């Protein structure tokens, strides 16, 4: 029996694994699924627990529940490095050998070398991280009543006005009334600030959607600072550049949604990478490796029409997983692989609990409709991996 | 018309104000009630929100609701000093003059000059403080999952094994299962440590009850270090003395229940004070001042039978308030005052939500019975100050 090793149980990894379990018969191969946690989390909704609008347990599921213990062997450990020559994967507590390898370790934050951003700012990339963000903000609001001169406790700075940042500041904006009521806080004193180095909010997106989103968020008191880069980050706050002059923002909380890169383990293992990402062949394999597959945020796909990269998304990650599952099955049985072509359908960005903006099939959508559509998509992924029972569980 | 000014709306202050409300007519005197908050909190239960076993709103009530808008004028401000000579009380937002003064500003923490104890340890003395404590602890538990090597996050040091410390560690012990469930924490790694400089817990209490309480709490994994004083306190933890040799405990959370003193305002105003408290005459007046009354934790009472001091408690504070109300009513109307005689009917100490120990009148009580007893006492105070409606609201 040949050995298939999947690193990371994210969208790409979980979809690849479930695909392989569905397609292959017993002892056709030995499949090992590796994750640093015994759970798989819904990354696309991680902004809600970070704000506290949703419990974090509703954003994750047990891996053992989803998979087949007979077909797939699950290992809970942390990947340290990959040795291409030895075809071996190093772990915190052991080592593994692969005939075939699928890499889906997802993304890690890119702080661009900005000072203090790594040490003193938070990221929305895991259950742990969002629990920390939530509890941090609650702690600051708790501290304010005893020390009312410190309005920096009530100031939250979100760096980067991208997809994630917009969704997050929307959730925070919705969370603020209950949060203020809980800690005897004057709602007027609260400051939610979204800071973008780029000249436009949601750069590379349709201006109508951007302006609508900006109007809605601004109505709920969210402030936007545009064309404003962050020079440095401290525990007290951030230093930004306005009109070519340094300016200071005092904030107990700084959340970084500025940029992401592929996992550093991949680059550190000797792969040639752009932004930590691998520009894979039409079969989603690593260039030079017939037995190594890259999925999700780790893989880089270029759009032949405009020669610009596809953004790192869960939507395309799932498709990577399905394609890799099929190609692995074919490779295992002697067959020919099918080239991967991405089909990018609608996309929705939430703006609080009851509002959203997005493009589906060329058709722009707003409000309650778009909100329900996004909820629908989430339910679709839940169904796809867990069935009706998983959707019922939440 | 004479002017009576009441400083602090605690047990003594609130009871005094309500008593004056019942006894006097609409123009017999001018009564001013001063508080730094617009609410009165149930100090005797503040340990529950501190652990997170109860919502903080269940520990407080609005002052304007309880009193009579016609009879008593309520001022929300923070007392700064009292000028005995001018008979004036200075405030953050104004000043007042008194013909008669009632001082019931309660207690402040006493750290005895132990290093770093004031700066880096928490106290259970207000709604704000317990919200800060609970959110702090939750924050540490939130941080643990990302850094499992930092077990100091799961270590809580409670200094002083008095009434408050014992009740608090009991509440923490009950709180730990849900807390651990919330943040993916192994309960075995959690350490709750109660540190006492004295060789025995709860001096002046029945040793059977004490040993029983320690047995019960010890069953819940609570650690006791007795005869161990705290040499100093740091953000990392505390430094204690064992066998005349220094030892270190690494703890993210340190809560001080070691000692209390009378409000520092009293001492700073030129009054003669012992432990920040005033040894009052049989009429609860300040020695040398016929128009100044001291109540609650600010007042020091000695038992004439055995010459030992009465501990600063809510029960005796309430009794102080009623006595001062009666005596002031007599003084304004030309009558004879009655000396204060304290009647201590016993007190019960909780050991988590479902356990307690206590002596009532003469009968020793354990378990669910004692727990229900404590709840009943709470109901008694609630009825006494707010009527049936106050009890009904909770
Ligand atoms: C708030 C937020 C909102 C988003 N909304 C959308 C949306 O609406 N639509 C959309 O298309 N995309 C959205 N995305 C992007 C989407 O979530 C990611 O593109 C998706 O996670 C793809 O990443 P992945 O499949 O490669 O794996 P990931 O989701 O990144 O998961 C990687 C897995 O591997 C584990 N892991 C990582 N390193 C190791 C290691 N050394 N050892 C062991 N295990 C490891 C991790 O614990 C994790 O389980 C959003 C992202 C965020 C943060
Ligand atoms: C966990 C805990 C459990 C306890 N259990 C019991 C028990 O079971 N039985 C018992 O008899 N006793 C118990 N006690 C003790 C009791 O709570 C206090 O002794 C009680 O509060 C009496 O103090 P006080 O009424 O004088 O003032 P406090 O109740 O302490 O407060 C005085 C009021 O004045 C306000 N104030 C303070 N300073 C200022 C200022 N400068 N300006 C304006 N306002 C101010 C405060 O906000 C407060 O509202 C317990 C105490 C604690 C912490
Ligand atoms: C149900 C009809 C709408 C179809 C659009 C789906 C495209 C789409 C868009 C997303 O933003 C996704 C985010 C996470 C997972 C899947 C996603 N999908 O599948």
Author numbering:
A (entry chain B), B (entry chain A): 3 to 396
Task: Please give sentences taken from the publication describing this entry.
Unlike the large multi-subunit complex of the proton pumping type I NADH:quinone oxidoreducatase (complex I) and the sodium pumping type NADH:quinone oxidoreducatase (NQR), the type II NADH:quinone oxidoreducatase (NDH-2) is a single subunit monotopic membrane-protein with a molecular mass range of 40–70 kDa. NDH-2 catalyses exergonic oxidation of NADH and quinone reduction through the co-factor FAD or FMN. NDH-2 comprises two Rossmann folds that are responsible for binding NADH and housing the co-factor FAD (non-covalently), are central to NADH oxidation. These domains are followed by a C-terminal membrane-anchoring domain in which the quinone-binding site (Q-site) is localised, allowing electron transfer from the reduced FAD to the acceptor quinone pooled in the membrane.
